[PDB]
Amino acid sequence: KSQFERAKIEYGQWGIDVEEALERLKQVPISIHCWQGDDVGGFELSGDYPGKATTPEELRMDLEKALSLIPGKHRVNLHAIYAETDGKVVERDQLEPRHFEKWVRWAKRHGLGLDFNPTLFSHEKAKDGLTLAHPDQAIRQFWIDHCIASRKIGEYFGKELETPCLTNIWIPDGYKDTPSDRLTPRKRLKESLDQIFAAEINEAYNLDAVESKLFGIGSESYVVGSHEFYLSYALKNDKLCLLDTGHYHPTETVSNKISAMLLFHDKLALHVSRPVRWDSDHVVTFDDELREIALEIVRNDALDRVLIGLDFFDASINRIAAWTIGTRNVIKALLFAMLIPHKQLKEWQETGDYTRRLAVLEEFKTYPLGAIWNEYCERMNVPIKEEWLKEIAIYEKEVLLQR
Amino acid sequence: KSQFERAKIEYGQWGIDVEEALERLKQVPISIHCWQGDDVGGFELDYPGKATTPEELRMDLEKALSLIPGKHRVNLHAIYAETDGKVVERDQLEPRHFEKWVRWAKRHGLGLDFNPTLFSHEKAKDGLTLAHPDQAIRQFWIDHCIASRKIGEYFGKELETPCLTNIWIPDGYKDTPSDRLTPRKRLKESLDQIFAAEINEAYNLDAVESKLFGIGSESYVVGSHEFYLSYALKNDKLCLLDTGHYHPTETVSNKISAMLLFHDKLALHVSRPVRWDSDHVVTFDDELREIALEIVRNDALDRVLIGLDFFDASINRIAAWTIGTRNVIKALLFAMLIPHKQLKEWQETGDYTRRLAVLEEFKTYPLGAIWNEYCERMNVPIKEEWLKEIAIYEKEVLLQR
Numbered sequence: 013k014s015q016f017e018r019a020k021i022e023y024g025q026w027g028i029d030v031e032e033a034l035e036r037l038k039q040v041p042i043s044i045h046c047w048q049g050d051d052v053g054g055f056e057l058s059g060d061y062p063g064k065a066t067t068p069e070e071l072r073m074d075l076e077k078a079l080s081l082i083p084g085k086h087r088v089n090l091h092a093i094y095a096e097t098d099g100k101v102v103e104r105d106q107l108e109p110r111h112f113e114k115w116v117r118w119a120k121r122h123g124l125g126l127d128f129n130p131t132l133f134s135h136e137k138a139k140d141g142l143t144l145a146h147p148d149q150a151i152r153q154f155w156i157d158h159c160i161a162s163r164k165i166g167e168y169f170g171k172e173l174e175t176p177c178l179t180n181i182w183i184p185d186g187y188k189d190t191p192s193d194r195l196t197p198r199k200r201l202k203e204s205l206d207q208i209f210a211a212e213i214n215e216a217y218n219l220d221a222v223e224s225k226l227f228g229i230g231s232e233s234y235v236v237g238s239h240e241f242y243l244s245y246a247l248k249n250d251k252l253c254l255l256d257t258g259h260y261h262p263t264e265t266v267s268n269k270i271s272a273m274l275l276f277h278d279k280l281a282l283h284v285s286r287p288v289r290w291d292s293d294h295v296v297t298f299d300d301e302l303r304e305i306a307l308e309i310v311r312n313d314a315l316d317r318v319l320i321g322l323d324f325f326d327a328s329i330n331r332i333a334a335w336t337i338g339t340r341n342v343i344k345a346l347l348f349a350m351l352i353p354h355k356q357l358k359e360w361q362e363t364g365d366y367t368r369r370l371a372v373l374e375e376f377k378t379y380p381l382g383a384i385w386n387e388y389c390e391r392m393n394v395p396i397k398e399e400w401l402k403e404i405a406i407y408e409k410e411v412l413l414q415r
Numbered sequence: 416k417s418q419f420e421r422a423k424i425e426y427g428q429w430g431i432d433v434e435e436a437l438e439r440l441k442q443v444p445i446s447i448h449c450w451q452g453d454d455v456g457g458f459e460l461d462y463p464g465k466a467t468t469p470e471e472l473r474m475d476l477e478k479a480l481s482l483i484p485g486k487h488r489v490n491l492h493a494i495y496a497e498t499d500g501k502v503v504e505r506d507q508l509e510p511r512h513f514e515k516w517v518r519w520a521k522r523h524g525l526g527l528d529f530n531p532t533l534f535s536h537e538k539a540k541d542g543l544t545l546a547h548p549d550q551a552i553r554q555f556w557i558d559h560c561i562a563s564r565k566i567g568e569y570f571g572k573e574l575e576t577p578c579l580t581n582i583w584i585p586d587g588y589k590d591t592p593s594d595r596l597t598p599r600k601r602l603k604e605s606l607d608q609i610f611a612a613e614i615n616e617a618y619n620l621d622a623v624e625s626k627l628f629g630i631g632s633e634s635y636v637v638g639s640h641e642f643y644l645s646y647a648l649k650n651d652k653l654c655l656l657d658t659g660h661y662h663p664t665e666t667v668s669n670k671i672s673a674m675l676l677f678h679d680k681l682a683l684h685v686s687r688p689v690r691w692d693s694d695h696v697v698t699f700d701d702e703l704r705e706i707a708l709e710i711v712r713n714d715a716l717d718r719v720l721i722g723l724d725f726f727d728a729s730i731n732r733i734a735a736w737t738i739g740t741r742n743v744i745k746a747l748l749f750a751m752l753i754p755h756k757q758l759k760e761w762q763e764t765g766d767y768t769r770r771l772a773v774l775e776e777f778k779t780y781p782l783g784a785i786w787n788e789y790c791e792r793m794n795v796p797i798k799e800e801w802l803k804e805i806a807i808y809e810k811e812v813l814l815q816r
């Protein structure tokens with residue numbers, strides 16, 4: 013109120029225009045993933061926290077509860093196993109725009125954008141833990157086909173919703189133990205991708221992303237689609253790199269990659285999740301790396317160029333909370349990065365005044381961000397501070413515990 | 416030796432042709448670095464008997480080469496110019512300053528690889544170089560790098576084997592930076608300039624080398640992995656992968672096959688990192704073997720330009736080159752003697768059991784016997800006998816300095 017007004021001049025002494033940051037913050041959309049809501053079940057025909065969603069309509073209502081507690085206007089990220097086959101078995105190579113018709117009517121209803129993923133796991137045709145890179149041509153051909161279907165589905169979304177859909181390819185391909193050939197399976201991956209992307213699609217409707225991973229449970233020794241593979245591949249073929257913050261080496265940092273991608277790519281894509289010693293997929297927290305990512309997005313004038321998304325899955329807590337704690341933190345960090353004096357911070361590093369650059373970065377860690385954040389929440393009709401938690405408790409009592 | 420002959424039979428049982436491997440191995444050159452010899456001192460205007468002159472450095476190089484089987488290459492740094500009387504600025508370096516290097520190389524059947532020197536200099540005092548905010552600095556280093564590209568050219572013309580000019584810069588910041596992008600933009604502008612004039616690839620090839628961090632550069636490094644990997648991809652240059660230069664538990668091994676899909680050629684420095692880019696003499700370890708396997712089994716023996724990059728001053732410096740280069744040849748050898756065909760086929764077919772047993776069993780196959788034969792056909796001392804040469808040499812020459 014005036015708690016907010018005194019906070020406002022503290023930033024104004026630096027020439028930081030907070031009113032302006034709040035307009036700019038209003039418009040950045042976070043793509044939130046639907047898989048959190050039903051523990052990555054999907055709707056495919058053929059001891060955790062209670063109350064997950066188990067039907068398409070339960071999942072939608074849940075997405076709305078979370079959105080109603082998160083400020084701004086955002087997007088929903090779908091997986092192909094979220095198809096509504098209408099009680100028919102439809103093979104993955106056969107999924108079609110009319111299978112996601114309900115999702116699109118619902119997105120249009122709420123002003124959501126929509127993003128997409130082919131699903132290449134939990135399937136008969138993926139038991140050997142190889143896929144687009146399986147030695148068999150009929151397996152490889154099945155998954156190529158499905159990725160081509162998803163490309164069409166994504167175009168569908170962009171067509172219908174008037175906003176580019178990002179279709180991202182992730183594969184689980186690898187070997188648990190030491191490989192005796194690293195070159196051939198990657199070669200097949202290249203061929204499998206050359207095919208998947210054979211046909212142009214208007215960039216206004218769809219964009220293609222590839223996401224690497226360093227290792228999985230069951231692919232601990234070697235993953236086919238690696239950081240260097242997808243980097244070279246994306247650059248050569250004008251695709252987007254999707255970076256997941258849980259997908260790298262120990263100590264390995266995504267914030268250090270962003271400025272280097274920005275030099276050779278018009279756009280890139282982000283999945284923010286929290287790794288605790290593996291791609292554990294913990295809920296995102298307002299931590300140093302999260303802020304350091306935000307810093308890079310803002311300093312580098314990259315808000316139209318970094319497509320921000322969430323990737324996490326905690327079933328040990330309330331799932332609607334996961335979504336809300338996740339997104340609020342990533343918004344907080346953008347806000348924080350928006351409230352940094354980059355102009356003087358940058359001149360100090362140009363001039364080598366490392367003393368002030370250290371001093372002031374340090375001192376902004378206690379600048380009154382809560383006060384700005386709180387007001388932003390109030391203007392955007394969501395609960396300030398820990399209040400959103402009352403709303404999850406009602407919803408858990410009335411709705412979620414009844415399932 | 417019959418001993419060899421029994422070994423030969425054990426490998427042949429799998430279909431592996433030892434004699435063919437030996438003839439293959441003899442063919443591969445390893446780029447040996449000069450800076451081991453004088454502690455990266457250079458000639459520009461701790462264990463005793465490091466070299467203090469070009470002739471000493473050469474004698475030492477010769478002695479080392481005579482304890483290593485094969486016919487190899489030498490890697491020079493710009494600070495190793497022979498400038499006769501004068502002081503020459505690094506932006507004024509010309510081929511005439513490496514004439515004596517080339518005359519010696521040709522005589523000895525060696526190739527010469529090359530590196531501009533972007534460190535220990537007034538103009539690199541701030542720890543930025545090509546990405547310095549100041550034009551005059553960047554400009555000066557651009558010229559040095561351009562001057563170096565011509566010297567690589569001169570080398571390759573003179574030695575009828577292409578020269579690898581590698582660029583490595585120290586640029587980064589000690590503590591958390593407030594702009595990670597524009598220094599990288601400046602490096603980009605800079606290399607564009609450096610590579611602007613075209614040189615024939617029969618004489619010279621350009622490479623670029625990233626690093627994660629260095630002392631005084633812990634927090635951020637302008638020339639990062641992603642940066643150079645993108646750059647060499649846009650402008651048809653080489654990536655140089657230094658095994659000492661990546662995150663904890665990150666292997667260069669896993670990168671080789673990803674990269675071969677997209678570049679004709681690729682360069683490596685091998686050196687042992689012990690918890691940082693510490694540049695320890697190369698050992699015959701897990702990582703080395705996994706690297707060797709990757710080159711041999713991917714057919715990249717002509718596509719991967721192998722070099723050394725360590726600096727250990729706590730032991731005999733001749734010994735350093737020889738242990739080091741001998742393990743990288745040892746490891747290539749071991750990789751040629753592995754039954755890839757049936758191993759590839761077991762993985763293709765599901766039999767991961769046989770894949771594991773057999774990689775494992777080959778860890779006891781009789782490598783030594785073959786290696787020993789190889790050293791004798793190549794007229795270098797076998798096993799440890801090479802210490803004696805070293806010890807005679809330490810006395811007669813090393814210690815009268």
Ligand SMILES: [Mn+2]
Nearest residue numbers: 223256283323
């Ligand atoms: Mn992901």
Ligand SMILES: [Mn+2]
Nearest residue numbers: 256258291323
């Ligand atoms: Mn993940």
Ligand SMILES: [Mn+2]
Nearest residue numbers: 624657684724
């Ligand atoms: Mn190196």
Ligand SMILES: [Mn+2]
Nearest residue numbers: 657659692694
């Ligand atoms: Mn190193």
